[PDB]
Write an enzyme that holds these catalytic residues in place. Structure first.
Site, mmCIF file in Angstrom:
data_model
loop_
_atom_site.group_PDB
_atom_site.id
_atom_site.type_symbol
_atom_site.label_atom_id
_atom_site.label_comp_id
_atom_site.label_asym_id
_atom_site.label_seq_id
_atom_site.Cartn_x
_atom_site.Cartn_y
_atom_site.Cartn_z
ATOM 1 N N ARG A 152 2.626 -22.907 -2.987
ATOM 2 C CA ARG A 152 3.544 -22.536 -1.914
ATOM 3 C C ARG A 152 3.505 -23.528 -0.761
ATOM 4 N NH1 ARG A 152 -0.693 -19.094 -2.320
ATOM 5 N NH2 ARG A 152 -2.104 -18.928 -0.525
ATOM 6 N N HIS B 15 3.333 -15.967 7.792
ATOM 7 C CA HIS B 15 3.070 -14.611 7.332
ATOM 8 C C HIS B 15 1.776 -14.030 7.878
ATOM 9 C CE1 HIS B 15 2.711 -11.087 4.920
ATOM 10 N NE2 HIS B 15 1.794 -11.582 4.109
HETATM 11 C C1 LIG Z 1 5.373 -8.197 6.111
HETATM 12 C C2 LIG Z 1 3.906 -8.135 5.777
HETATM 13 C C3 LIG Z 1 3.511 -7.880 4.468
HETATM 14 C C4 LIG Z 1 2.161 -7.817 4.128
HETATM 15 N N1 LIG Z 1 1.817 -7.563 2.813
HETATM 16 C C5 LIG Z 1 0.553 -7.507 2.513
HETATM 17 C C6 LIG Z 1 0.196 -7.240 1.137
HETATM 18 O O1 LIG Z 1 0.984 -7.058 0.214
HETATM 19 N N2 LIG Z 1 -1.162 -7.200 0.912
HETATM 20 C C7 LIG Z 1 -2.151 -7.389 1.862
HETATM 21 O O2 LIG Z 1 -3.333 -7.321 1.507
HETATM 22 N N3 LIG Z 1 -1.804 -7.639 3.158
HETATM 23 C C8 LIG Z 1 -0.519 -7.693 3.454
HETATM 24 N N4 LIG Z 1 -0.162 -7.947 4.752
HETATM 25 C C9 LIG Z 1 -1.223 -8.136 5.749
HETATM 26 C C10 LIG Z 1 -1.709 -6.823 6.355
HETATM 27 O O3 LIG Z 1 -0.597 -6.022 6.756
HETATM 28 C C11 LIG Z 1 -2.574 -7.118 7.580
HETATM 29 O O4 LIG Z 1 -3.438 -8.206 7.283
HETATM 30 C C12 LIG Z 1 -3.426 -5.935 8.037
HETATM 31 O O5 LIG Z 1 -3.511 -4.981 6.979
HETATM 32 C C13 LIG Z 1 -2.897 -5.281 9.294
HETATM 33 O O6 LIG Z 1 -3.737 -4.157 9.627
HETATM 34 P P1 LIG Z 1 -4.518 -4.104 10.992
HETATM 35 O O7 LIG Z 1 -4.735 -2.652 11.428
HETATM 36 O O8 LIG Z 1 -5.739 -4.930 10.913
HETATM 37 O O9 LIG Z 1 -3.483 -4.762 11.986
HETATM 38 P P2 LIG Z 1 -2.186 -4.031 12.526
HETATM 39 O O10 LIG Z 1 -1.888 -2.844 11.691
HETATM 40 O O11 LIG Z 1 -1.062 -5.062 12.597
HETATM 41 O O12 LIG Z 1 -2.580 -3.596 13.976
HETATM 42 C C14 LIG Z 1 -1.589 -3.109 14.903
HETATM 43 C C15 LIG Z 1 -2.142 -1.927 15.659
HETATM 44 O O13 LIG Z 1 -2.763 -2.384 16.883
HETATM 45 C C16 LIG Z 1 -2.095 -1.826 17.998
HETATM 46 N N5 LIG Z 1 -2.031 -2.831 19.052
HETATM 47 C C17 LIG Z 1 -1.801 -4.173 18.904
HETATM 48 N N6 LIG Z 1 -1.798 -4.842 20.031
HETATM 49 C C18 LIG Z 1 -2.043 -3.871 20.989
HETATM 50 C C19 LIG Z 1 -2.164 -3.930 22.390
HETATM 51 N N7 LIG Z 1 -2.049 -5.056 23.099
HETATM 52 N N8 LIG Z 1 -2.411 -2.776 23.047
HETATM 53 C C20 LIG Z 1 -2.528 -1.647 22.343
HETATM 54 N N9 LIG Z 1 -2.433 -1.469 21.024
HETATM 55 C C21 LIG Z 1 -2.190 -2.627 20.400
HETATM 56 C C22 LIG Z 1 -0.732 -1.365 17.489
HETATM 57 O O14 LIG Z 1 -0.231 -0.299 18.287
HETATM 58 C C23 LIG Z 1 -1.099 -0.898 16.082
HETATM 59 O O15 LIG Z 1 -1.644 0.415 16.094
HETATM 60 C C24 LIG Z 1 1.195 -8.014 5.125
HETATM 61 C C25 LIG Z 1 1.584 -8.268 6.433
HETATM 62 C C26 LIG Z 1 2.932 -8.331 6.770
HETATM 63 C C27 LIG Z 1 3.324 -8.613 8.194
#
Ligand SMILES: Cc1cc2nc3c(=O)[nH]c(=O)nc-3n(C[C@H](O)[C@H](O)[C@H](O)COP(=O)(O)OP(=O)(O)OC[C@H]3O[C@@H](n4cnc5c(N)ncnc54)[C@H](O)[C@@H]3O)c2cc1C
Ligand SMILES: Cc1cc2nc3c(=O)[nH]c(=O)nc-3n(C[C@H](O)[C@H](O)[C@H](O)COP(=O)(O)OP(=O)(O)OC[C@H]3O[C@@H](n4cnc5c(N)ncnc54)[C@H](O)[C@@H]3O)c2cc1C
Ligand code: SF4
Ligand code: SF4
Ligand code: F3S
Ligand code: F3S
Ligand code: FES
Lengths: 631, 257, 111, 131, 127
Positions: free
Chosen positions: A329, A400
């Site tokens: 990619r 991404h």
């Molecule tokens: C389109 C897309 C497709 C994906 N597909 C895959 C896949 O197929 N397989 C895979 O393994 N991973 C995939 N990923 C990656 C995966 O979604 C992320 O790596 C990870 O799972 C996000 O989870 P997280 O809770 O760590 O972050 P997030 O869920 O992004 O955390 C966001 C959270 O933090 C809060 N927050 C953020 N900033 C603040 C702030 N300043 N103040 C207060 N609250 C805040 C938000 O309110 C929310 O609750 C994908 C990502 C995207 C964007």
């Protein structure tokens, strides 16, 4: 200095040895501690639910309407686990080796092995919670290959696996909330971190409904705020994703680990104009049965299906004859960007390359192709308005994922004591490239089977309470936040926030994108302060502080992005090698593959905020490999 | 394409709202409805007026945060799609398009097009889960689930919580959402031990939240973006009837903080 | 010359080490191979079913009327396993020792 | 069950009259030599089940032949066969090769000779003498 | 439909002794085909009923029994076998003494599947 605090001895028993070594908190004493969790994604919700089950007083925050509205809900791909249900050679050691090799040897081995070891418990907990994974006719679970992996170790639930996982985590969090152990704060965002006596002892937040500024105090703070891929204006993540919390933490004393490590996706829908700001992520399997091309004449106004096959400049086939047209990619995306920048674009704005399926349709059967990707074709028809069966599909790669983040040790604790970073907001263990269907399992591992042990070990060494919200540090942070908000509202310039965001995104994509060179990075580093000054001089943010003003939030996020982009470019310039997503045009093999320098750059670069946005201090954490040797 | 728009504008929860008319001269048919709203907001900001506020997070029809009623039909004239998924290639030149938020007693209005949907969260909190702690899970392949049951549970579980069913229902009831959650959690063995209580609790919470009753009209299914069939409601009904036979009594309602 | 190709190290983890060392075939590439399985006994039928589940193009042959007429159908005794369900001291190592001693020390220990 | 089967076959009730027994060959521990990957000397030829030497040594234990066969079929052969196949290019050999024609000609000649001998003794007599 | 390697522990699902004994009684079918050649209609009802009863009395066969029987029955009708007049020659001829209760169980399963709107799949065309 940075202490990894990794255990010793054999890698198969390091996690158990550390669990036995760590201290514990008695269940009666658990109710006397308060923990703040910022974020309601997979990692944040799982951690909040687990800590509420343990007994700690948990405070959860999210800027969305509900915790289920957080990201990681659009994760179409499945989740990996070393269960070997398919009986094809998969194992925990195999998963660890694959993860460490896919990261191009830029991450600690202990974290990777721990994640691979706890993936099985992740899957068991997800199944028991009621997540409807795909099942075969006999009633057992089903597995599929992730488009290139040598084993079928991926568990999926139709095309919305991330949605089901987040729904399960949010159901657990709601159960904890009903018990009264966890207090939820939706539609509020963290604006500053209050550190007392060298410990992260609170946060300063602002709810967007009323604009009220609030201060919260707790014994520990966890930052599950997700990645920072939205620094580039065009990205595949949500509109609200940002880096405000992690940038504030880094400013307060936390160390940023490898900010220049970013991952891109090759297949995304090109925008139809400057108004659009998001690119939809389709899949990785569309290039398997498709050929990428561009018309030979840049002014070809004819329909793409009517263009003769001899009149099409089939790049990626004339170039790179090997790999069976299945180029990585990175190379394909770089070539697409190069041919789009040369003026040979095919989209309305000149961005995008053609991907025709007519050859695949003629060669294969229409029914088999329709069953192979029919939902994707329907969604592409809904968005673009053109049938993929009869018209070539326009695609354009986009950013991404962000492998970079705040540096954490084996205990998932940043440089600032009492501050834990989990999920996508930390460097974690993906190294220089994140393997497919591994981010979700990493977040779930951090939330469920890792954070409780480390947080209990940290909390057992300190006395609960003792810090209130009347301390001078909280007042200073609140005053700084209020002054910044007042200044942003009082600038009232001419250009909008979106214009500055688009300018920064274009500059970063052109210079700090997949193809990076010293001259381009230096030019971007020179240009960034001018853009920041123009933003702070000629921005227009209407409304009032005590209202539902989204422009103020966008302005704050854009200011944080402006501050962070300089450090990102500095780190990109500093790393004089190509590894994983980070690719340098002066360090690569003639075939185009990245070339590593394992005797000069086999370390993790943590950046310390020295108060100057142009000269941050550098710290090196050496990487030693004992089980998987670099190749 | 020249589009005349009538936007519902409201300053806050207490201030009464009214309709405001706007004209857009050059609208690309390819752009989505939310992109047009962003363009109009940018134009208003350039002119010096207050931009329109609306909910949008994913722009992919998965998060469910987006919520708009367009031309009297929620999520636009087209069915089985969300507001963010609606593009103006299906509209006609010179048409007048009216946009309003959800209108219900359980969904307070906070801005021009932003509403509060915490009532769904409170409904979910009232037993709409499985009480399994972390680390006590057995092996994944311990309990077999038939493919038909798993498929039906997946169909019922794919609810983005947009709340369009409440706004589209003439009674303003949340029956489709509760029914979908109950059906998703009742078709799997893991939800068996506490289903008969669960539904009652959920139903009671709905009655406590201010939602109406269900007349079995059928707007919920015709408007739901994910095409959740009405049979889930029937399933819920059956469960409730069974829960009535065994003497299950609802617990105390979930009081918001 | 004859090469046993047995793994090294402790006997408890030799099989897992060999499994990690051995190469793999991608699931998409599995359909491009053809395997002939002569025989429909217990081993033959099990191997054919497993390889068909994997994705390989399997050809099975038998001289009887049906695949179910192999002489493995005629076994009356049970099947041994080191599960220790009777709490009488059985184990994997005990089964290995018993099997190697019953063969009068004329077979490889790894198998 | 054993008494009923013996009464059905022999025709004499073992409850009142002594039964007759005679030992006979039951199993063959010998076979084609295989390595740890269940591959014979010829590359690409795998021998599983009772046709290989396997691991029974000079005497197999009870309820072990079925266990060995199921082990070879289920949890052993796929790994080794994948290891072998990952090192070679699929396809490339058709049934038009001269080796196939030579083998077919040899088989046809053998069958024709066997049918054309038309001696006096039956096949069963020779088998009985050899046994 | 269970693949190799995905099996849970053997003692995970308990099976009552009566059910196991009935399942073993129904499963002991050598497939000799005497039932087909004994019935005046030339039907394969006893064989299909025995297989269905064997696979339906155990929990592992529960998730897909109602489809299974219908498919099997359809295949019989596609193969050219006759109907069942409930005469009883197959049971009296069958070497393993499979009783007519298997036919009753098959009939009950078919009726229940018909109540659920189960549609038979495409027939198995011989190569
Ligand atoms: C389109 C897309 C497709 C994906 N597909 C895959 C896949 O197929 N397989 C895979 O393994 N991973 C995939 N990923 C990656 C995966 O979604 C992320 O790596 C990870 O799972 C996000 O989870 P997280 O809770 O760590 O972050 P997030 O869920 O992004 O955390 C966001 C959270 O933090 C809060 N927050 C953020 N900033 C603040 C702030 N300043 N103040 C207060 N609250 C805040 C938000 O309110 C929310 O609750 C994908 C990502 C995207 C964007
Ligand atoms: C009476 C008896 C009782 C036994 N009892 C026990 C017991 O209690 N416990 C135990 O552990 N073991 C027992 N065994 C041993 C066990 O049954 C065998 O070791 C077992 O059959 C070996 O597995 P297999 O796959 O080779 O089966 P087999 O039945 O030996 O395999 C033969 C298969 O190969 C096919 N085949 C053969 N030659 C050709 C050819 N030229 N072309 C095409 N196809 C061909 C046949 O059609 C058949 O499908 C017993 C054996 C016998 C004979
Ligand atoms: S049931 Fe349908 S309409 Fe109602 S909230 Fe869920 S997705 Fe929206
Ligand atoms: S007669 Fe009995 S043993 Fe023979 S095929 Fe019919 S049911 Fe089976
Ligand atoms: S149409 Fe309305 S009355 Fe009930 S069944 Fe649907 S919510
Ligand atoms: S004799 Fe034949 S017709 Fe039916 S009842 Fe028995 S299979
Ligand atoms: S913005 Fe997410 S569903 Fe519309």
């Amino acid at each position: 200095v940075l202490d990894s605090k990794v255990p010793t001895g054999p890698i198969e028993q390091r996690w158990d040895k550390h669990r036995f070594e760590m201290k514990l908190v008695n269940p009666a004493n658990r109710r006397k501690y308060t923990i703040i969790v910022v974020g309601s994604g997979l990692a944040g919700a799982s951690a909040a639910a687990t800590l509420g089950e343990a007994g700690y007083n948990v405070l959860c925050f999210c800027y969305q309407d509900s915790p289920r509205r957080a990201h990681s809900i659009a994760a179409q791909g499945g989740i990996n686990a070393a269960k070997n249900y398919r009986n094809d050679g998969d194992s925990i050691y195999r998963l660890f080796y694959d993860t460490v090799k896919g990261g191009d040897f830029r991450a600690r081995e202990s974290n990777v092995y721990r994640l691979a070891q706890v993936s099985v418990n992740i899957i068991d907990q997800c199944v028991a919670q009621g997540v409807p994974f795909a099942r075969e006719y006999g009633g057992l679970l089903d597995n599929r290959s992730f488009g290139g992996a040598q084993v079928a170790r991926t568990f999926y639930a139709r095309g919305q696996t991330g949605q089901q996982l987040l729904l399960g985590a949010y159901q657990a969090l709601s159960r904890q909330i009903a018990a009264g152990t966890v207090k939820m704060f939706p539609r509020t965002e963290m604006l500053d971190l209050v550190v007392v006596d060298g410990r992260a002892r609170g946060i300063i937040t602002r709810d967007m409904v009323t604009g009220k500024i609030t201060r919260y105090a707790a014994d520990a703070v966890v930052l599950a705020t997700g990645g920072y891929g939205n620094v580039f204006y065009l990205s595949t993540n949500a509109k609200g994703c940002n880096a405000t919390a992690i940038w504030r933490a880094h400013r307060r004393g936390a160390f940023f680990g490898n900010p220049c490590f970013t991952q891109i996706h090759p297949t995304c829908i090109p925008v139809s104009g400057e108004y659009q700001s998001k690119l939809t992520l389709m899949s990785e399997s569309l290039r398997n049965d498709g050929r990428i091309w561009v018309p030979k004449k840049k002014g070809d106004t004819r329909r793409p299906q009517d263009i003769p096959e001899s009149e099409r400049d089939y790049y990626l086939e004339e170039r790179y004859p090997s790999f069976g047209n299945l180029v990585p990619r990175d190379i394909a995306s770089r070539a697409a960007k190069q041919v789009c920048d040369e003026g040979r674009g095919v989209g309305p704005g000149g961005l995008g390359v053609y991907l025709d399926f007519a050859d695949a349709i003629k060669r294969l059967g229409r029914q088999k192709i329709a069953e192979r990707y029919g939902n994707l074709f329907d969604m592409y028809k809904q968005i673009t308005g053109e049938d993929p069966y009869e018209t070539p599909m326009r695609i354009y790669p986009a950013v991404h994922y962000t492998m970079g983040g705040l540096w954490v040790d084996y205990n998932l604790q940043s440089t600032i004591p009492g501050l834990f970073v989990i999920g996508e907001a930390n460097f974690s263990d993906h190294g220089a490239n994140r393997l497919g269907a591994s981010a979700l399992m990493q977040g779930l591992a951090d939330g469920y089977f890792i954070l409780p042990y480390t947080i209990a070990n940290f909390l057992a060494q300190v006395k609960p309470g003792g810090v209130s919200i009347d301390r001078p540090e909280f007042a200073e942070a609140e005053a700084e936040i209020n002054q910044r908000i007042q200044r942003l509202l009082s600038i009232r310039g001419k250009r909008t926030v979106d214009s500055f965001h688009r300018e920064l995104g274009k500059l970063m994509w052109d210079k700090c994108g997949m193809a990076r060179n010293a001259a381009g990075l230096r030019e971007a580093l020179q240009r960034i302060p001018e853009i920041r000054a123009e933003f702070w001089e000629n921005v227009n943010v209407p409304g009032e502080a005590n209202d539902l003003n989204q422009a103020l939030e966008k302005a704050g996020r854009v200011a944080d992005f402006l501050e962070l982009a300089e450090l990102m470019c500095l780190d990109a310039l500093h790393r004089e090698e190509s590894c994983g997503g980070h690719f340098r045009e002066e360090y690569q093999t003639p075939d185009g593959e990245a070339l590593r320098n394992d005797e000069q750059f086999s370390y993790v670069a943590a950046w310390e905020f020295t108060g100057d946005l142009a000269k941050p201090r550098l710290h090196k954490e050496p990487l030693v490999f004992e089980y998987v040797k670099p190749t | 394409m020249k589009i005349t728009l009538k936007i519902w504008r409201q300053k806050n929860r207490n201030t009464p709202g009214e309709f405001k008319t706007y004209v857009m001269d050059n609208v690309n048919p390819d752009m989505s409805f939310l992109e047009m709203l962003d363009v109009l907001n940018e134009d208003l900001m350039s002119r010096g007026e207050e931009p329109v506020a609306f909910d949008h997070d994913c722009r992919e029809g998965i998060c469910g945060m987006c919520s708009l009623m367009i031309n009297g039909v929620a999520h636009g004239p087209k069915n089985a799609i969300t507001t963010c998924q609606l593009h103006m290639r299906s509209f006609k030149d010179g048409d007048t398009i009216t946009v309003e938020p959800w209108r219900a007693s359980a969904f307070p209005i906070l801005k021009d097009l932003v509403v509060d949907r915490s009532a769904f969260d409170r409904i979910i909190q009232a037993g709409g889960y499985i009480s399994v702690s972390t680390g006590s899970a057995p092996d994944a392949n311990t309990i077999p689930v038939s493919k038909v049951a798993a498929d039906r549970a997946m169909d019922a579980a794919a609810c983005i919580g947009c709340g369009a069913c409440v706004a589209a229902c003439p009674n303003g009831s949340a029956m489709l959402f509760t029914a979908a959650k109950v059906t998703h959690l009742a078709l799997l063995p893991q939800g068996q031990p506490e289903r008969y209580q669960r539904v009652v609790n959920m139903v009671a919470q709905a009655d406590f939240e201010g939602f109406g009753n269900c007349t079995n009209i059928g707007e919920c299914a015709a408007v739901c973006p994910k095409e959740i069939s009405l049979e889930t409601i029937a399933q819920l009904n059956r469960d409730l009837v069974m829960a009535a036979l065994r003497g299950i009594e609802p617990n105390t309602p979930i009081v918001p903080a």
